[PDB]
Amino acid sequence: QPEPDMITIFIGTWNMGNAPPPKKITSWFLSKGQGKTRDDSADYIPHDIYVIGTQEDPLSEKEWLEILKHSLQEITSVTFKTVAIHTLWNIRIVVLAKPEHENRISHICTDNVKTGIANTLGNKGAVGVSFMFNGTSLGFVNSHLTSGSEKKLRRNQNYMNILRFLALGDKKLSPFNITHRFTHLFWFGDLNYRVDLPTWEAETIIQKIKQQQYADLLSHDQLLTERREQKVFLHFEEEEITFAPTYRFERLTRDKYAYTKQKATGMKYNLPSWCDRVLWKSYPLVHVVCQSYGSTSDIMTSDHSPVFATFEAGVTSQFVSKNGPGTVDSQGQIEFLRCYATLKTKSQTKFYLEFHSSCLESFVKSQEGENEEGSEGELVVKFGETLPKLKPIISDPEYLLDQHILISIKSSDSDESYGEGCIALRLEATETQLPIYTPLTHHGELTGHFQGEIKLQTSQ
Ligand SMILES: CC(=O)Nc1cccc2nonc12
């Protein structure tokens, strides 16, 4: 039975509005309703992995697992295995997998982050799951961010706290936050970004939604605008939105948006908005294709509609050679040539690099680079041809070309990372000097760039 080189992943996000679900929620897992929907011819074909995020979830873990497993069994006739379940307050993530994947999945991690202080600490935050699927690391974040049209900056702060403090994936990757630890990272939830139009325009917005004319609404979506101004979710992707706003509905129909201020809303308007989202970030030159992104039309117990997204995701096999794992393979090498980091920092410490990759036995520290002044004020750290030659565990190009090198640039004075990035070894040529580039981030904000050349030797 061969190991897969592609899997499909279902991501669901639903704010349940503290109400039990209806008896049938199969439309969700089938990607049926509005938006980019799944072809009917696929309905019996199970996804490899189903990741369900809920918010305002009133059920016990047991209650929801029974509904989910029985739902998938009805669709697919497959009894899914529970990989992980983790709940913070009423925020929950469930990971289910086809039974054939049970002995491909390992290194399962769960964590949560509570956002805010005092007043603002007590119901918002995130849960997450990570695991290995053969040679591929997968991370999943379900976040319920701060509500309210006038709190987009709070949401952005919530995002940064979650990606700093959620402790998933390989702890040996110590300079790296979750936005660098995974081949594929999916971040979804009730992100709570709103359509930023005047309150007086509520009926106009509703009109536009009834005509399926979303362009003038999406141009005011706070998540799209904040992302475009690099305020949040830097280097993440989102499929185009082609479904109606998923909030705020009257319960038990989808015919009415309930937007007017009420005691129950703290006298806040809830103009129709795309609160409920799925974004991802994959390592450079790894296959990831969104095959659906939409909302259900027939699940009406909540003031939110469920959102689905499905993905094709490239995976790799757990590679064994006569040499690595357990030793280096002298027919392999990675050389970084004429490299320099451009940093936004005003500080004047020396810097060194760390190279982290599961193709190395352990991480590699460089010598200190040479600081020069950039023409427009910048710090440029020059490494020249001084960088250590990296010794991969496996030289076979079918393995090595599928790998990635994480780079941290660290202060000699503090050993703190000033920037993190990632370089793909999926090169156009071996034994050939080729340009490389990554942006550098720290706490998910841009701090600089790393560029230079690479020369990769494989056994072929
Ligand atoms: C510990 C647990 O609850 N579940 C699992 C552990 C390891 C692999 C699995 N594959 O499916 N479910 C899995």
- Examine the domain organization and report whether 410 and 430 are in the same domain: yes
86 and 141 inside one domain: yes
Joined together, the tokens standing for residue 216 give 């003038």
Cβ–ligand 1 contact at 454 (below 6 Å): no
Q: Give the three-state DSSP class for 324.
A: coil
Distance between CA atoms of 351 and 348, rounded to whole angstroms?
Answer: 9
Point out the domain boundary residue: 305, 325, 345.
325
Documented resolution in Å: 1.5
Closest residue CA from atom 4 of ligand 1 = 83
Handedness of CA 265, 224, 110, 125 (dihedral sign): negative
Give the nearest ligand 1 atom to 102 CA.
10
SS3 219: coil
Spacing, Cα 125 to ligand 1 middle (Å): 25
- Same domain for 174 and 288, yes or no, is yes
Amino acid at 114: K
Residues in contact with 9: Cβ distance below 8 Å, sequence separation at least 6, in sequence order: 47, 48, 49, 50, 51, 138, 184, 186, 310, 311, 313
Q: Tell the residue number behind the tokens 């918010």, with chain if given.
A: 55
Method: X-ray
> Does residue 313 sit in the same domain as residue 411?
no
Instruction: Determine the distance separating the centroid of ligand 1 and the alpha carbon of 299, expressed in angstroms.
Output: 29
Say whether both 288 and 346 belong to one domain: no
455 lines ligand 1 (CB under 6 A): no
Which residue among 94, 95, 105 has the greatest number of ligand 1 atoms within 8 angstroms of its CB, and so is best to mutate? 105
Cβ–ligand 1 distance for 61 under 6 Å, the answer: no
Outline where DSSP puts E strands in 173-234.
184-190
- Report the candidate in 51, 61, 18 with the shortest Cα–Cα distance to residue 310: 51
- Contact (Cβ atoms closer than 8 angstroms) between residue 139 and residue 169: yes
Domain count, the chain: 2
Choose one of 108, 110, 131, 133 to mutate for the ligand 1 pocket test, by most ligand atoms within 8 angstroms of C-beta: 108
**Is residue 220 domain-shared with residue 251, that is, in the same domain?**
yes
Q: What is the dihedral of CA 377, 375, 412, 230, to 10 degrees?
A: 60
On whether both 337 and 374 belong to a single domain, the answer is yes
State whether the beta carbon of 100 lies less than 6 angstroms from ligand 1: no
Based on the fold, state whether residues 88 and 192 are members of the same structural domain: yes
Q: For residue 419, what are the domain limits?
A: 326-460
Are the C-beta atoms of residues 14 and 303 closer than 8 Å to each other?
no
Q: Domain ends where: 325, 355, 381?
A: 325
Parallel, antiparallel, or unpaired: how do β-strands 125-133 and 136-144 relate? antiparallel
Helix (H, G, I), strand (E, B) or coil at 397: helix
339 and 257, same structural domain? no
Q: Identify whether the C-beta of residue 112 lies closer than 8 Å to the C-beta of residue 89.
A: no
What are 446's strand-pairing partners?
441
What's phi and psi for 415, nearest 5 deg?
60, 20
In terms of domains, do 206 and 159 share one? yes
What are the backbone dihedrals phi and psi of residue 281, each rounded to the nearest 5 degrees, phi first? -145, 120
Residue 454: phi and psi, rounded to 5, are -125, 155
The span from the CA of 167 to the CA of 110, in Å, is 8
* 127 plus 265 within the same structural domain: yes
Using alpha carbons only, what angle is made at residue 413 by residues 407 and 418, rounded to the nearest 5 degrees? 35
Same domain as 318, residue 389: no
Report d(CA 275, CA 294) in Å as an integer.
13
Cβ atoms within 10 Å, residue 45: 11
| Count of H-run helices and E-run strands, the chain | 8, 21
| Domain C-terminal end among 274, 293, 325 | 325
SS3 260: coil
